[PDB]
Design a protein around this ligand. Structure first.
Ligand code: MG
Lengths: 630, 374
């Protein structure tokens, strides 16, 4: 839905990737593509970021192959796919592999709501795809396999000789996109960061282009049988033509208009909150909110957002402009639907429509008006959480929205009177995630000491694990469009039940539940940083075990690195899995250190850096006058 | 008899690539808004650009001025060098010491017709040079006694359209550490020009090694990890919009002095702001200190070439090192359109006020340390 909307509204942001393909010889051998040459796309990229769950899920249950018969066969297919990306991107200065860690509670509720459906479908109707979760035996095998493959590449591929390889595996918290964004913010905060640094990101989700805008790096690219580029620079030209308004009582500033448009996109739909009854992206709800924003921008006295914080007094004007239209939008929807479906229970198009809605969906007495306003305030708090999570890192790990449904815009009263404050909370341990987001069918993925809690009628938490649950299709046509009426986790009860037991775990299981660390790997060829790491950590004049990178010697990677205990440099590299389907190396040319980002103690800021040199116009005078007219 | 150095036409000096020993910063000092001297970089600022349409005349009544009736001689430069000598336990190897402004006037002399006047002195084999403050003040009294132009533009208003553009174009910390409000609010900050960062550099022309002091406006990123590497300095300047090629001639003549002034401290980048004739800022442009002579040569609208300036400075410095050999004060003068620089000894002993007693006492202590070491 998001792509079909974007492609049709902004078609010039797309271009096909120039791919150079390996030569196959008469004996069936493959010649590897020499990536030391210039990139055939005609522009050179400093950094590549991989959202690795955009690869691991496809390999386990593909559309166009049989599934892999064992875990080693799956790791080999993951290397083949990952290698193909680096051959076409050819990153000159950083490669980052990010794997999903433990997520914030607000996201876990959406995963639980996905996985209970997958289990009830399999129950109503081999490798369980729920095994792709932090703290399973499968994620341990992946976490070893990726470090081997990077070390092996740093020994055997000349284009990687100057590359830094940064790994953030499943033992480190946060989702891949919410790791990658924090690394980009860390680099932008550094005083020596090159303002014309070129970035690429690989991943499946439509949020990546919204994140692209929210970086404010102008040359940023997004990547996704053939491949296509999306350019953030071309989308910024579209928005600069479309969002402009004359004669405003304040200085016009494009970055603020782009942030307001980004917020109005997350308002229409996101993973953390149910979408408003009045809005679906298929109905061009983004245009409706944009029109309301352009009509109120002359009188709000300024923009709706400031560096990822939202002005609730200004938000009221937007919601009032929507509330005046809800009854017309419902009539327009129902007229079009009843017209279409004639030609092919709540009654939203008749009078009294909101009283029947609150009765049928929330089970309240319709005459309680202030309950509607309470749901409204809870939803507005949700919108404030979502924007901060994208622009300023995770604002609370324990917050969530406690309803299966959304209020009407007519329920948002006096937002200017709200107080919004968030508490950071405790990040869940990997087993605390696994017990939160698994139904009892997949319990083979978790230690035996917890299995009873999922299935025993005497379990103190059995109510969190229903054997059957209601799905409301809500006038939609598919069980993936409908809402699962699953009960919410009372987190203290689950944590108490797992604080009891725990001493029963194996010493391996108890070790697997600890938090991890990021690592940087480099090749012995690197022209300065390898001299520094060997001299500072491994010469006889042993220094402190923590070290600060220098941007003139690191090629602009800024941060700190740490010596790893018990590791010995330049031993033999050994392939970890049973059948030796990949080579060993007798003397490993690579070296490994822990890696630490420069911490965002400040807010990040939505501004162009000094020394930015924006690309020349991709849009013509005619394209600008067409979109201004539309 | 008076002593004289003949200024030949540029053609006489041209075609010889006299070697320049690349500028190194080796000590630095700050003035704050109240004109207290401090060692180190506390008054340095980071560059970050202005809002393109803004009024340079805004706030003119509130401008805090450094009072140029006060004479500071060399005081900060001598103090900053004396600290480096205390830190290293040796005298510096440079034997000529000056503000950049005198070095610019010398280097411009083959092309510029303007008159200039200087006082100079010698001590323990080393030479020190300053502008004659009395001549500068008398010239500025005569310039301010002229009748106004038909456009009404005051030279003082032109000078404020200087410093306002520096306040619109800077921030007190790297971009990563300032708030949004500290960038957006800058139109309404009241301008001060008593606050400065002075960089001291070691440099040399041919066989002579020279120590220069001078002002530097801003830096593009952090200072380097170790001394003597190139630094990403910026100089900020303002002039009227180049509306026609008659203005381009005057601008390509200004670029001789801009290039000298940024070259002598190793400043790699100049950023120029263009005002309209009422004082609204209309655009900004970037120039590189290595390429300014090449661009002016390529347009051909002005006729100057820095190899003349460099060799003229080397020959003139060597001529001073031949003619000046003893203490007292000498006056150097260039008459208006004069074909010869004049030299004369004006005071027989001491230094006037060109050198501090603290600097004398420090060098006396240092020569006593040489004797004690030997
Ligand atoms: Mg300046």
């Amino acid at each position: 839905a998001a792509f079909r909307w974007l492609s049709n509204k902004y078609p010039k942001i797309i271009s096909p990737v120039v791919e150079e393909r390996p030569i196959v010889m008469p004996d069936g051998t493959e010649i590897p593509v020499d990536a030391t040459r210039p990139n055939p796309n005609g522009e050179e990229f400093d950094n590549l970021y991989l959202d690795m769950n955009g690869i691991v899920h496809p390999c386990s249950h593909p559309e166009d192959k049989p599934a892999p018969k064992d875990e080693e066969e799956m790791m080999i297919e993951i290397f083949k796919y990952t290698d193909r990306i680096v051959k076409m991107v050819r990153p000159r200065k950083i490669l980052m592999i990010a794997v999903d860690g433990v997520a914030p509670r607000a996201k876990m509720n959406q995963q639980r709501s996905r996985r209970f459906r997958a289990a009830q479908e399999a129950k109503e109707k081999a490798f369980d795809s729920n095994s792709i979760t932090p703290g399973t035996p499968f994620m341990d095998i992946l976490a070893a396999s990726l470090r081997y493959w990077c070390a092996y590449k740093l020994n055997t591929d000349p284009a990687w000789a100057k590359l830094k390889v940064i790994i953030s595996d499943a033992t480190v918290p946060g989702e891949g996109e919410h790791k990658i964004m924090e690394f980009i913010r860390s680099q932008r905060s550094s005083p020596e960061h090159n303002p014309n640094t070129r970035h690429v990101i690989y991943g499946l989700d439509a949020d990546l282009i919204m994140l692209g805008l929210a970086t404010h790096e102008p040359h940023f690219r997004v990547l996704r049988k053939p491949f296509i580029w999306l350019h953030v620079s071309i989308l910024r030209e579209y928005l600069a033509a479309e969002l402009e308004v004359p004669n405003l009582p304040f200085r016009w500033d494009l970055e603020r208009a782009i942030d307001d448009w980004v917020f109005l996109c997350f308002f229409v739909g996101n993973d953390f909150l149910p979408h408003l009854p009045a809005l679906e992206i298929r109905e061009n709800g983004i245009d409706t909110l944009t029109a309301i924003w352009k009509d109120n921008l002359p009188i709000m006295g300024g923009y709706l957002t400031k560096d990822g914080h939202v002005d609730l007094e200004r938000a009221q004007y937007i919601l009032n402009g929507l509330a005046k239209q809800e009854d017309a939008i419902f009539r327009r929807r129902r007229e079009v639907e009843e017209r279409r479906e004639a030609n092919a229970t709540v009654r939203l198009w008749e009078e009294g429509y909101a009283d029947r809605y609150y009765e049928q969906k929330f089970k309240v007495d319709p005459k309680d008006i202030e309950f509607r306003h309470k749901v409204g305030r809870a939803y507005a708090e949700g919108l404030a959480w979502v924007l901060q999570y994208y622009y300023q890192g995770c604002p609370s790990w324990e917050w969530f929205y406690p309803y299966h449904y959304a209020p009407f815009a007519a329920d948002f009263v006096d937002l200017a009177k709200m107080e919004i404050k968030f508490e950071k909370g405790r990040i869940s341990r990997p087993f605390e995630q696994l017990m939160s987001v698994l139904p009892a069918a997949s319990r083979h993925a978790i230690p035996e000491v917890y299995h009873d809690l999922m299935t025993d009628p005497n379990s103190p938490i059995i109510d969190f694990y229903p054997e059957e649950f209601e799905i409301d299709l809500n006038g939609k046509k598919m069980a993936w469009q409908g809402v699962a009426l699953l009960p919410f986790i009372e987190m203290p009860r689950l944590l108490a039940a797992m604080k009891e037991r725990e001493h029963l775990l194996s010493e391996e299981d108890r070790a697997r539940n600890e938090p991890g660390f990021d690592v940087l790997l480099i090749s012995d060829a690197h022209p300065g940083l390898y001299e520094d790491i060997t001299s500072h950590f491994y010469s006889k004049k042993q220094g402190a075990p923590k070290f600060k990178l220098n941007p003139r010697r690191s090629d602009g990677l800024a941060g700190k690195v740490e010596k790893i205990e018990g590791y010995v440099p330049h031993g033999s590299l050994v392939y970890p899995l049973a059948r030796n389907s990949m080579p060993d190396v007798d003397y490993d040319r690579s070296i490994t250190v822990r890696y630490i980002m420069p911490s965002s103690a400040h807010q990040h800021k939505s501004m162009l850096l000094r020394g930015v040199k924006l690309p020349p116009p991709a849009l013509s005078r005619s394209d600008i006058e067409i979109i201004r007219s539309k | 008899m008076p002593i004289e150095f003949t200024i030949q036409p540029p053609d006489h000096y041209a075609g010889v690539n006299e070697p320049v020993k690349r500028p190194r910063e080796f000590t630095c000092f700050s003035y704050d808004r109240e004109r207290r001297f401090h060692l180190g970089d506390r008054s340095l600022k980071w560059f970050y650009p202005a809002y393109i349409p803004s009024d340079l005349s805004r706030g003119y009544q509130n401008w805090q001025r450094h009072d140029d009736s006060i004479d500071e001689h060399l005081d900060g430069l001598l103090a900053a060098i004396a600290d480096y000598e205390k830190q290293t336990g040796k005298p510096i190897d440079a034997h000529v010491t000056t503000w950049r402004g005198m070095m610019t006037k010398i280097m411009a002399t083959p092309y510029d017709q303007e008159e200039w006047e200087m006082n100079a002195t010698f001590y323990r084999g080393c030479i020190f040079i300053e502008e004659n403050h009395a001549f500068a003040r008398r010239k500025k009294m005569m310039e301010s006694s002229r009748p106004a132009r038909s456009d009404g533009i005051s030279p003082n208003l032109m000078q404020y359209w200087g410093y306002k553009f520096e306040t619109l174009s800077t921030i007190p910390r790297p971009w990563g550490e300032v708030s949004r409000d500290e960038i957006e609010s800058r139109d309404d900050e009241i301008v001060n020009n008593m606050e400065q960062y002075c960089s001291v550099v070691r440099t040399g022309f041919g066989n002579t090694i020279v120590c220069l002091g001078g002002e530097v406006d801003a830096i593009w990123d952090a200072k380097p990890e170790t001394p003597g590497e190139p630094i990403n300095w910026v100089e900020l300047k303002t002039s009227r919009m180049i509306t026609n090629t008659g203005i381009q001639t005057a601008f390509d003549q200004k670029l001789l002095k801009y290039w000298i002034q940024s070259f002598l401290l190793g400043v790699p980048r100049i950023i120029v702001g263009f005002r309209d004739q009422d004082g609204i800022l209309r655009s900004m442009e970037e120039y590189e200190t290595l390429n300014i002579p090449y661009e002016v040569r390529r347009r051909g609208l002005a006729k100057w070439d820095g190899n003349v300036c460099i060799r003229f400075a080397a020959l003139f410095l060597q001529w001073l090192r031949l003619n000046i050999t003893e203490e007292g004060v000498w006056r150097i003068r260039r008459p208006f359109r004069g074909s010869r620089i004049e030299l004369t000894k004006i005071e027989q002993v001491g230094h006037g006020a060109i050198i501090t007693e603290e600097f004398m006492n420090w060098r006396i202590k240092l020569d006593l340390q040489k004797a004690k070491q030997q």
